[PDB]
């Protein structure tokens, strides 16, 4: 899912009764991985610990 | 049926409100009887003027 922003009209606070604020919310949804690690060639440059 | 007026108050920014429920009550009224009664004789209705 790509980002969906949706807008939240009351906010509430610590005894359940609202604040007079609002707010916006926004997500979106991916993942990814290797599939074969033999592939690629990767150089690494150890330093002096 | 009688009320009270909603009770205010002076809030700043990002403060939750206080719970305002207005109290009501109800007059009532009852309906009581009077009479009154004055005989009369058949000689004296008819007799007197």
Do not use: C
């Amino acid at each position: 899912i790509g980002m969906t922003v949706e807008f939240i009209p009351h906010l509430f606070g610590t005894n359940r009764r609202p604040n007079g604020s609002r707010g916006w919310f926004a997500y979106y949804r991916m993942g990814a991985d290797v599939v074969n690690p033999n592939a690629f060639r990767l150089l690494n440059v150890e330093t002096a610990s | 049926v009688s009320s009270a007026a909603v009770q205010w108050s002076w809030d700043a920014e990002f403060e939750e409100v206080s719970d305002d429920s207005p109290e009501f009550g109800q007059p009532e009224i009852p309906v009581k009887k009077a009479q009154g009664f004055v005989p009369i004789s058949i000689e004296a209705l008819q007799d007197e003027a």
